[PDB]
Tab-separated table of C-alpha atoms in Angstrom:
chain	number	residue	atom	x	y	z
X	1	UNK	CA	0.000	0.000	0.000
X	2	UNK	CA	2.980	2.304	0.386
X	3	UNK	CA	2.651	4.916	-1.972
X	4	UNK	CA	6.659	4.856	-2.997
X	5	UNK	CA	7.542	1.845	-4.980
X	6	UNK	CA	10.364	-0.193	-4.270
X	7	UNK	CA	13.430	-0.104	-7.127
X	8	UNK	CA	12.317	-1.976	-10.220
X	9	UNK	CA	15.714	-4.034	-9.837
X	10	UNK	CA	14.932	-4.950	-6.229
X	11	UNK	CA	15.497	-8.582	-5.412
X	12	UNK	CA	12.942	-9.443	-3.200
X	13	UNK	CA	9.475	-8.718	-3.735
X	14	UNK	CA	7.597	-6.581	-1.089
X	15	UNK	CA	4.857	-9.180	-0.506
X	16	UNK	CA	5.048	-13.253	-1.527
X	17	UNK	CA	2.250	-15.635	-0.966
X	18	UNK	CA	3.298	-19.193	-0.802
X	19	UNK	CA	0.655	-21.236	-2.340
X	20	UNK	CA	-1.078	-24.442	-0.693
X	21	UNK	CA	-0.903	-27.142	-3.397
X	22	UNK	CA	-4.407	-27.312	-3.682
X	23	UNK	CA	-4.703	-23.120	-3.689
X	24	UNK	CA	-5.704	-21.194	-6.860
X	25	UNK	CA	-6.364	-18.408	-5.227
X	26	UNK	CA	-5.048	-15.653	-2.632
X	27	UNK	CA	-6.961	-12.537	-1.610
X	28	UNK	CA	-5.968	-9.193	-0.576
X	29	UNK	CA	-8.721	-7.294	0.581
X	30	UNK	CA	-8.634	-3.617	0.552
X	31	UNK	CA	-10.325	-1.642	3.245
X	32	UNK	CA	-10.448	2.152	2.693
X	33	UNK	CA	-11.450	4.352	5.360
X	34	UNK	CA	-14.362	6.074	3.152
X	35	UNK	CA	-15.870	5.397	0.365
X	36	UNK	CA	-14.251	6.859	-3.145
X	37	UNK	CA	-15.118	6.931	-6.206
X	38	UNK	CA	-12.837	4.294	-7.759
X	39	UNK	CA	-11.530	4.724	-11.099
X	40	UNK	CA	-8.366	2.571	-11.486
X	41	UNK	CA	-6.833	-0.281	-9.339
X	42	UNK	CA	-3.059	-0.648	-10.121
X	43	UNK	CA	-1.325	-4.086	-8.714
X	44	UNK	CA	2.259	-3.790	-9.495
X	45	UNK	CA	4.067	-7.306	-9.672
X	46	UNK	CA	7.674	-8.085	-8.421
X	47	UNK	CA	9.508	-7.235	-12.018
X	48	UNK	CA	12.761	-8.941	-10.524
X	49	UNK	CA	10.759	-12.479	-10.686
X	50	UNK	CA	7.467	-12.168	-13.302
X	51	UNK	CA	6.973	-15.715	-12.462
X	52	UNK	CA	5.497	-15.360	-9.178
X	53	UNK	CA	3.359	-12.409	-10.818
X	54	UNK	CA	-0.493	-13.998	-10.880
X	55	UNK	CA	-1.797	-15.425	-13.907
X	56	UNK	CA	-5.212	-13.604	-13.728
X	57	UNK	CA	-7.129	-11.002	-11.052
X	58	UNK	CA	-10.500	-11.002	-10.075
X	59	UNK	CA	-11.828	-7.463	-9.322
X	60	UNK	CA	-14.581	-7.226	-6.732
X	61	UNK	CA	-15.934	-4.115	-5.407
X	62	UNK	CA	-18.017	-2.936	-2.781
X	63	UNK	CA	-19.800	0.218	-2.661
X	64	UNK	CA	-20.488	-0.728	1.076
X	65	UNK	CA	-17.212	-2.361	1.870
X	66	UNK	CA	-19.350	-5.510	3.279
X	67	UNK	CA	-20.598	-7.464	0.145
X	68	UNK	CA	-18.298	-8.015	-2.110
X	69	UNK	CA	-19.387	-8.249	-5.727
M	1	UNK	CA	40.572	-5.588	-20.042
M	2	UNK	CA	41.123	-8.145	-17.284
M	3	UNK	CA	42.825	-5.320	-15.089
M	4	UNK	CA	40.128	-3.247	-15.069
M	5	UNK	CA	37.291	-6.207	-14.657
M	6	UNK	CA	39.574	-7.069	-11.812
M	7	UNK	CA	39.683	-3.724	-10.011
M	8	UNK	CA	35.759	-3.508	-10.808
M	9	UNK	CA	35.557	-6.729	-8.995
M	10	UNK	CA	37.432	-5.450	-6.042
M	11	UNK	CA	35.573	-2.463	-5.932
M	12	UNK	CA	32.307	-4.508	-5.828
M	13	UNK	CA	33.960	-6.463	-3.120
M	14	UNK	CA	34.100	-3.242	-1.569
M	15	UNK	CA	30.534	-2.526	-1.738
M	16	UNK	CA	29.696	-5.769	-0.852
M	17	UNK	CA	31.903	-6.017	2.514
M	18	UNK	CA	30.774	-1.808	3.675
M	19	UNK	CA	26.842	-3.376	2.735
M	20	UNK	CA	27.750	-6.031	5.082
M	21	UNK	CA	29.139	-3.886	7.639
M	22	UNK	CA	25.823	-1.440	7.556
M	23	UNK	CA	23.633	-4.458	7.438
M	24	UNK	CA	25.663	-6.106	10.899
M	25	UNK	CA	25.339	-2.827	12.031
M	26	UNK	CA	21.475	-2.610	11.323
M	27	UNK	CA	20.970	-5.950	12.402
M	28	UNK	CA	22.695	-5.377	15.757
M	29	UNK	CA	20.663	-1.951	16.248
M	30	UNK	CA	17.855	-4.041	15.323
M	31	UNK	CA	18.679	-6.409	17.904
M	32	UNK	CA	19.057	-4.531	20.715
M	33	UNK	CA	15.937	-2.264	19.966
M	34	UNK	CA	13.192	-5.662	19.846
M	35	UNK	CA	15.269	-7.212	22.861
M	36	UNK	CA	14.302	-3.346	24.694
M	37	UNK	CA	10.678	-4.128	23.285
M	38	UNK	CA	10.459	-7.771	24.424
M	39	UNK	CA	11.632	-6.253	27.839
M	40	UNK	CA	8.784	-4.009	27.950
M	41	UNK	CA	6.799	-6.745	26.687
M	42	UNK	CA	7.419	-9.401	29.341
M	43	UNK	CA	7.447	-6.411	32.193
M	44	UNK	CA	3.885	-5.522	30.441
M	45	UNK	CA	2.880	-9.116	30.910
M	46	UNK	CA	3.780	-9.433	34.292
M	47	UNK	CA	2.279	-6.052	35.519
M	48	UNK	CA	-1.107	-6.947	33.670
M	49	UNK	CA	-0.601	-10.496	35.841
M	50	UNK	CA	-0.193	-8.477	38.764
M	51	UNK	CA	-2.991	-5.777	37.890
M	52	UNK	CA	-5.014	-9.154	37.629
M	53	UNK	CA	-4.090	-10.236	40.906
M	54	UNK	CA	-5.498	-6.742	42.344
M	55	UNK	CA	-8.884	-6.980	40.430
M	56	UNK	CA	-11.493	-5.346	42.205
M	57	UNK	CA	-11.698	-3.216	45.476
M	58	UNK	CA	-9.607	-5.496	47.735
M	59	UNK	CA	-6.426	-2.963	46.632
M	60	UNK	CA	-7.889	0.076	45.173
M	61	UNK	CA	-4.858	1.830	46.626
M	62	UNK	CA	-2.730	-0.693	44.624
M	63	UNK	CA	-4.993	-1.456	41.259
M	64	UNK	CA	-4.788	2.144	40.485
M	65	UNK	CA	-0.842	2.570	41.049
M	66	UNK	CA	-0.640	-0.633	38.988
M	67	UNK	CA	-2.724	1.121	36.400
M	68	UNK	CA	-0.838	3.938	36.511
M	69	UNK	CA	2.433	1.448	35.996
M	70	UNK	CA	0.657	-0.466	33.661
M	71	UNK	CA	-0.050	2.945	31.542
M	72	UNK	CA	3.707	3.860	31.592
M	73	UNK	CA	4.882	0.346	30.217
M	74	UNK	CA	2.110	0.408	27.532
M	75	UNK	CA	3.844	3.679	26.494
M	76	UNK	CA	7.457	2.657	26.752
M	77	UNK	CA	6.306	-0.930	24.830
M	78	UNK	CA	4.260	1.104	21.949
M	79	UNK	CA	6.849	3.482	21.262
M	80	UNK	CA	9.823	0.869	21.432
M	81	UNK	CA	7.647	-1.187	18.724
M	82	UNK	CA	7.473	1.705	16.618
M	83	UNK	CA	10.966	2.468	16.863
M	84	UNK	CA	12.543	-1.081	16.597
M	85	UNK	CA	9.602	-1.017	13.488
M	86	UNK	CA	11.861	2.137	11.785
M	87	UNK	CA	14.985	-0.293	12.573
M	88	UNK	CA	13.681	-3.270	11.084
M	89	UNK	CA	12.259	-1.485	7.705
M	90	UNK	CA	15.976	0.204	7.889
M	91	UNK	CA	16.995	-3.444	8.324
M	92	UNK	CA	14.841	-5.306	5.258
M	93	UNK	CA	16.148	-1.678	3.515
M	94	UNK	CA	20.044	-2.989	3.943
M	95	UNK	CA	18.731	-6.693	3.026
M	96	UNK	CA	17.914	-5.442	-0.008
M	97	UNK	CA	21.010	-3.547	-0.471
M	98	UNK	CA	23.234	-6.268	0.324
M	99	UNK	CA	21.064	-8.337	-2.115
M	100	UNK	CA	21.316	-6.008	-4.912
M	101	UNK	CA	25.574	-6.008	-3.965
M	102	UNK	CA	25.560	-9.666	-4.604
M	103	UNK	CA	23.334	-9.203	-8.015
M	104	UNK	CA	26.483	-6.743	-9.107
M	105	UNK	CA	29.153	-8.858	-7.848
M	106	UNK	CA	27.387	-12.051	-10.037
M	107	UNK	CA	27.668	-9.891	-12.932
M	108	UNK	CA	31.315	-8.998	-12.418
M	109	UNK	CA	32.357	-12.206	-11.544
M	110	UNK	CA	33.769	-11.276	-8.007
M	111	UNK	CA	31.604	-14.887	-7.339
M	112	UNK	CA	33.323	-15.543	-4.076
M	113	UNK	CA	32.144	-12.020	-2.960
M	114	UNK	CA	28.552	-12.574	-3.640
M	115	UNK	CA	28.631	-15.495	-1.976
M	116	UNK	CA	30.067	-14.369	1.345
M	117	UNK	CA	27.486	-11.514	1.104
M	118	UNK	CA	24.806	-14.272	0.295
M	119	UNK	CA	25.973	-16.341	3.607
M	120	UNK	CA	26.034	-13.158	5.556
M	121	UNK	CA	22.521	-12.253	4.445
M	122	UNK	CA	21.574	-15.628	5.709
M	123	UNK	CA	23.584	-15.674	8.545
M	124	UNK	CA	22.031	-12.354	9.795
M	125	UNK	CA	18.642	-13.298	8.065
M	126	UNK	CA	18.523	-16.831	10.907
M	127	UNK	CA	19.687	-14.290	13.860
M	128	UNK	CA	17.386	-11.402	13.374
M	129	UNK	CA	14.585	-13.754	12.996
M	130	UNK	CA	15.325	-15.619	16.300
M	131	UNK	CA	15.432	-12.525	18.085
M	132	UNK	CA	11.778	-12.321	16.501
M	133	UNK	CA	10.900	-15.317	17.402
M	134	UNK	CA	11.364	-14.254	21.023
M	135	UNK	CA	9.633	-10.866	20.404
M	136	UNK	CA	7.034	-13.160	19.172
M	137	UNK	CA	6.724	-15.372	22.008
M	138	UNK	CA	7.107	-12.588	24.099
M	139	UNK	CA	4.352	-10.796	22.678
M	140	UNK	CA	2.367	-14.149	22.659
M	141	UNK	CA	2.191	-14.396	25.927
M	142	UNK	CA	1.887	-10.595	26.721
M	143	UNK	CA	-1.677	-11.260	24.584
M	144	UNK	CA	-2.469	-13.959	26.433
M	145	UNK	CA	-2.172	-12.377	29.638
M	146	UNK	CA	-3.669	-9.176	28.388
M	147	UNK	CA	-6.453	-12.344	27.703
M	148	UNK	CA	-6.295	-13.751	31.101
M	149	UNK	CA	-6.604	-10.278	32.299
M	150	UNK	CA	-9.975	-9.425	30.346
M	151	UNK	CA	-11.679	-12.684	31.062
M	152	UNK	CA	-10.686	-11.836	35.307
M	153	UNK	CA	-12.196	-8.644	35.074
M	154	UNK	CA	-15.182	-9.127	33.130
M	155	UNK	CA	-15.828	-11.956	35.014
M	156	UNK	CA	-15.302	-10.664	38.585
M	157	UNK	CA	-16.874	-6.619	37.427
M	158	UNK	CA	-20.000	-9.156	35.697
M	159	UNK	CA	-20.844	-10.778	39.145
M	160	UNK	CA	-20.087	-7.072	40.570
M	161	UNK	CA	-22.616	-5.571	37.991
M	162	UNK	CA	-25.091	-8.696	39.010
M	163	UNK	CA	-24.905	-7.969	42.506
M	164	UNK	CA	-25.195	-3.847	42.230
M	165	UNK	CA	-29.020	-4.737	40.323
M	166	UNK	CA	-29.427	-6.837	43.357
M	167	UNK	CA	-28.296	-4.837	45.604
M	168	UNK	CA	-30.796	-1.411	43.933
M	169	UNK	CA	-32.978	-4.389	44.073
M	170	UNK	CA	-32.737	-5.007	48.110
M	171	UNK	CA	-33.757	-1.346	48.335
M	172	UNK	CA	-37.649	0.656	47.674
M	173	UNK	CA	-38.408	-1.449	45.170
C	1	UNK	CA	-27.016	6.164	-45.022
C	2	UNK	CA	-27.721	10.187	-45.205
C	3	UNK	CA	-25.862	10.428	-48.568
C	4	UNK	CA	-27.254	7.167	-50.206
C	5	UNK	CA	-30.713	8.349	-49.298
C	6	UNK	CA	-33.593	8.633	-51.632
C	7	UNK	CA	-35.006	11.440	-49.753
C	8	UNK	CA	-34.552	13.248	-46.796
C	9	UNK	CA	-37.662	12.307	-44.982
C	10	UNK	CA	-36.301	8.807	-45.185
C	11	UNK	CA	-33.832	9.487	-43.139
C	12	UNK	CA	-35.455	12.149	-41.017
C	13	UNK	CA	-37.959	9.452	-40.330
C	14	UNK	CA	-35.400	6.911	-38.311
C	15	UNK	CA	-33.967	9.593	-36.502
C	16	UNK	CA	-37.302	11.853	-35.816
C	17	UNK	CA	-38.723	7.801	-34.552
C	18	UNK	CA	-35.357	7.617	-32.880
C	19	UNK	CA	-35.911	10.822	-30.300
C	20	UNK	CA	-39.888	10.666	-30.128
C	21	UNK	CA	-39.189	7.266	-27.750
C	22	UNK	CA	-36.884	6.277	-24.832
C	23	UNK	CA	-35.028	3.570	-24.052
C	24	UNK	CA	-35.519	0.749	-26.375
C	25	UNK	CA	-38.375	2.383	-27.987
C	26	UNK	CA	-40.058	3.062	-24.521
C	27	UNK	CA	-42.706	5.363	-23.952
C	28	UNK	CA	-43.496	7.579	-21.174
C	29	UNK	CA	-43.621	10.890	-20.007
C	30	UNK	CA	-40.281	11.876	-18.804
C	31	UNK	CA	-38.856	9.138	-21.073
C	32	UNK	CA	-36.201	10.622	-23.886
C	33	UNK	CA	-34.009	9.403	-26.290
C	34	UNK	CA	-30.256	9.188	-25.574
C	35	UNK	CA	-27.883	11.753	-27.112
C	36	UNK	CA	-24.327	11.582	-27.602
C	37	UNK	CA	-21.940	14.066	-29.157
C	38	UNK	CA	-21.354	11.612	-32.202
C	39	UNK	CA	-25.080	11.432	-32.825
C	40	UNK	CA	-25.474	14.759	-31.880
C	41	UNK	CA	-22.886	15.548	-34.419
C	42	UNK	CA	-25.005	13.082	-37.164
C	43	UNK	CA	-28.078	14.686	-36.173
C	44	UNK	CA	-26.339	18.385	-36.944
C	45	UNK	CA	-25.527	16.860	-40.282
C	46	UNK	CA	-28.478	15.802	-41.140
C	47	UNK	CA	-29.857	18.726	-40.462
C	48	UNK	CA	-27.209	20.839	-42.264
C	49	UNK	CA	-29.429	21.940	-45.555
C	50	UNK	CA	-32.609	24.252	-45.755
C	51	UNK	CA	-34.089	21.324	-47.519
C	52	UNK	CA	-33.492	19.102	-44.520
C	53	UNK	CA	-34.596	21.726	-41.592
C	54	UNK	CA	-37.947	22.201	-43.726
C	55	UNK	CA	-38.496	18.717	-43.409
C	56	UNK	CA	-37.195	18.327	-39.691
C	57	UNK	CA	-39.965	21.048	-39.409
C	58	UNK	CA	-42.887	19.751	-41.112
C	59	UNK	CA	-42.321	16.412	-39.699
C	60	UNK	CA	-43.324	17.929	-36.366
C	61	UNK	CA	-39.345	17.802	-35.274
C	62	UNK	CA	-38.836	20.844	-33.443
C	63	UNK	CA	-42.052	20.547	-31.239
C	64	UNK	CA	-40.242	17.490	-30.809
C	65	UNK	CA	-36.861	18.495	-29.528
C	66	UNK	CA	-38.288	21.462	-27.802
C	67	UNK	CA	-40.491	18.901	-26.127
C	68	UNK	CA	-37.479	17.140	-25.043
C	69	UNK	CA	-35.506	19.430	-23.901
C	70	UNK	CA	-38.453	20.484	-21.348
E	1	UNK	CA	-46.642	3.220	13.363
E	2	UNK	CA	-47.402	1.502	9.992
E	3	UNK	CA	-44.807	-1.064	8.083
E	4	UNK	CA	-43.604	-0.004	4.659
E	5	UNK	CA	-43.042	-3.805	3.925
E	6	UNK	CA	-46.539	-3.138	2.210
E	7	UNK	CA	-45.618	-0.675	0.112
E	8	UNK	CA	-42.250	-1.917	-1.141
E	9	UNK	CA	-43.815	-4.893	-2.043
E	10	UNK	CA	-46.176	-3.113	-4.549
E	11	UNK	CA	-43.647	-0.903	-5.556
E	12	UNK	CA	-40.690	-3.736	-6.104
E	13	UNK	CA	-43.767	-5.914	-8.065
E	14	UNK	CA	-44.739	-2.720	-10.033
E	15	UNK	CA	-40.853	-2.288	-10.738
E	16	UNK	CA	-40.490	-6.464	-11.710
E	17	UNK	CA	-43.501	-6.090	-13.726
E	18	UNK	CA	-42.160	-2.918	-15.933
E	19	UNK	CA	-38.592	-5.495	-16.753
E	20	UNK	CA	-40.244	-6.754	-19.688
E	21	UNK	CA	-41.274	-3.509	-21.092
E	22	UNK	CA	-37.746	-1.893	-20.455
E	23	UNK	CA	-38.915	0.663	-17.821
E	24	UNK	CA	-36.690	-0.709	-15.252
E	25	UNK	CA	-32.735	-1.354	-15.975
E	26	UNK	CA	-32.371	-5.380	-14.237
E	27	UNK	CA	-28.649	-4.805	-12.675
E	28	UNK	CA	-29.489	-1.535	-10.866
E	29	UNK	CA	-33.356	-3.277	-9.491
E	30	UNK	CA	-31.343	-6.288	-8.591
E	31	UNK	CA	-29.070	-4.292	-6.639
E	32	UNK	CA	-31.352	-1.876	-5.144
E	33	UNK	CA	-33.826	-5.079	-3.806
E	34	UNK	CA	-30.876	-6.969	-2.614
E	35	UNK	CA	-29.524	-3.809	-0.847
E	36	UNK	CA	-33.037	-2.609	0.478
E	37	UNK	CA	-33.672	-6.349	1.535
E	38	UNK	CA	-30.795	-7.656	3.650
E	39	UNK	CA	-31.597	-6.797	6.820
E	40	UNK	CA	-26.513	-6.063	6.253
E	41	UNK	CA	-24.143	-8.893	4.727
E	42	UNK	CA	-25.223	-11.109	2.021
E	43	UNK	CA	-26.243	-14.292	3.218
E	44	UNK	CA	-27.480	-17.689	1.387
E	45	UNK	CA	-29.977	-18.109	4.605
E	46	UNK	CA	-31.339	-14.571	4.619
E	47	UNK	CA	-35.259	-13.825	4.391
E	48	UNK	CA	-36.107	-10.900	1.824
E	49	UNK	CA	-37.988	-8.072	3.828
C-alpha cells in the first residue's frame, strides 16, 4: 500500500504468498477508510521475478465495503 | 581488459563487505531495539498479571498505582515497537542492499564475494529472525495475559454488575 | 445512409422515430431518447441543408426536440 | 406506526412487472432489492424483507 515503490531491480518482492498445493487463489482485501469513487486499481508485480506475478485477477468491489461483488 | 574487470571486482567487493558492515550494524541496532521491546513486553505481561491479581476493590490503593504502571509500560512498549519497526524497515532496507551487492558482484564475476554476502545475508537473516521469534513469544504471551486479564475482570466486574441490580434491588423497590 | 438516401424524410424518419421514444423504444412521459456528441454531431448533419430543416420542421421535429428538452 | 413492507412490495412488483417492457434497468433493481432487503451482509440463509 505504500505509496513509494520499491526499485524496479529490487530482489525481493515486497509481498510473496506461498501457495497451498491445492490453492488457486489468494486474496488481498482492501479496506479504505471512506468510500471513493474508484476509477483505477493498479497491482504492481515483483519485475525482478514475473513468475510469481499472478496469472489472472479477479476485481470485486463494494460500494459498502461488506458485500463483495 | 582483465585489469580493469579485476579492479571492478574489487571495488564490488568493496561494496559488498561496507553493505555487510551497515547491514551487521542494522541488524545489531535491530537487535538490541526488539530485545528493549520484548523487555517491555514481558514487564507488560507481568504487571497486567499483577494488575489481575489486584482486580477489584480489595487494593484500590494498589490497582490504580498498577494502572498507573501499567499505563507507563504500555507507552514505553508502543513506542519501542514503533521504533525497533523504523529499525527493522531500515533493516529489510540494507537486506535489499546487500542483495542487490551480490546481483552486481554475479555480474562482475567477483563470485566468491557474492557469496560471502549471500551467507552473511543468511547468517544475519537466521539471527534477526530468532530474536523475533522471542519478540514473538514474548508478545504471545503478553496477549495472552492481556487475555487472562480481560476474562478476570469481566468476570469478577459481571458478578459485581449482578450484585449492584441486586443490591438497587434489596432497596424501595 | 444520409448520402445514399432517396429522400430526406427517409432518413429524417429513423432519426425523428429515434428521439420521439426512450429507451428501447419506450414510452413515457419523462422518457427521452439518448444523445451523444457523435449522434449529436449526425443529427447536426443531417440537419445541415434548408431542404433538410424544412423537413425536420414539417415532420413535427422541433415541437419534438423542444419537447425534449423540457 | 405503519410497516412499509406493504408498500415496497407493490412498488418492487410494479418495478419487476415494468422489466419486460424496459422501464426498469435489471442490474441496478437487482441491486437496489438486494440492498433494500438484507436486513446487512449477504447471506445464502437470509429472508427478503
Amino acid at each position: 500500500l505504500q505509496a513509494t515503490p520499491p526499485h524496479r531491480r529490487a530482489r525481493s518482492a515486497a509481498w510473496s504468498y506461498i501457495f497451498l498445493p491445492e490453492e488457486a487463489w489468494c486474496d488481498l482485501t482492501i479496506h479504505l477508510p471512506a468510500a471513493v469513487l474508484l476509477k483505477e486499481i493498479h497491482i504492481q508485480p515483483h519485475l525482478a521475478s514475473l513468475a510469481t506475478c499472478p496469472s489472472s485477477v479477479s476485481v470485486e468491489v463494494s460500494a459498502d465495503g461488506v458485500n463483495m461483488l | 581488459s582483465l585489469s580493469s574487470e579485476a579492479l571492478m571486482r574489487r571495488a564490488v567487493s568493496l561494496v559488498t563487505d561496507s553493505t555487510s558492515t551497515f547491514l551487521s550494524q542494522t541488524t545489531y541496532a535491530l537487535i538490541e531495539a526488539i530485545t528493549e521491546y520484548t523487555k517491555a513486553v514481558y514487564t507488560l505481561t507481568s504487571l497486567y498479571r499483577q494488575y489481575t491479581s489486584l482486580l477489584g476493590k480489595m487494593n484500590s490503593e494498589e490497582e490504580d498505582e498498577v494502572w498507573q504502571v501499567i499505563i507507563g509500560a504500555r507507552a514505553e512498549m508502543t513506542s519501542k515497537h514503533q521504533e525497533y519497526l523504523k529499525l527493522e524497515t531500515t533493516w529489510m532496507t540494507a537486506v535489499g542492499l546487500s542483495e542487490m551487492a551480490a546481483e552486481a558482484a554475479y555480474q562482475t564475476g567477483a563470485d566468491q564475494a557474492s557469496i560471502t554476502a549471500r551467507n552473511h545475508i543468511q547468517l544475519v537473516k537466521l539471527q534477526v529472525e530468532e530474536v523475533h521469534q522471542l519478540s514473538r513469544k514474548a508478545e504471545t504471551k503478553l496477549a495472552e495475559a492481556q487475555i487472562e486479564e480481560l476474562r478476570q475482570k469481566t468476570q469478577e466486574e459481571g458478578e459485581e454488575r449482578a450484585e449492584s441490580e441486586q443490591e438497587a434491588y434489596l432497596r424501595e423497590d | 445512409l444520409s448520402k445514399k438516401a432517396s429522400t430526406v424524410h427517409m432518413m429524417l424518419q429513423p432519426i425523428l422515430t429515434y428521439m420521439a421514444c426512450g429507451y428501447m423504444g419506450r414510452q413515457g412521459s419523462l422518457a427521452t431518447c439518448q444523445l451523444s456528441e457523435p449522434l449529436l454531431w449526425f443529427i447536426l448533419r443531417v440537419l445541415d441543408t434548408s431542404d433538410a430543416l424544412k423537413a425536420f420542421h414539417d415532420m413535427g421535429g422541433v415541437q419534438l426536440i423542444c419537447n425534449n428538452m423540457v | 406506526q405503519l410497516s412499509s413492507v406493504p408498500m415496497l412490495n407493490v412498488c418492487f412488483n410494479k418495478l419487476f412487472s415494468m422489466l419486460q417492457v424496459h422501464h426498469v434497468q435489471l442490474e441496478s433493481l437487482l441491486q437496489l432489492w438486494l440492498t433494500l432487503s438484507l436486513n446487512f451482509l449477504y447471506n445464502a440463509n437470509r429472508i427478503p424483507v
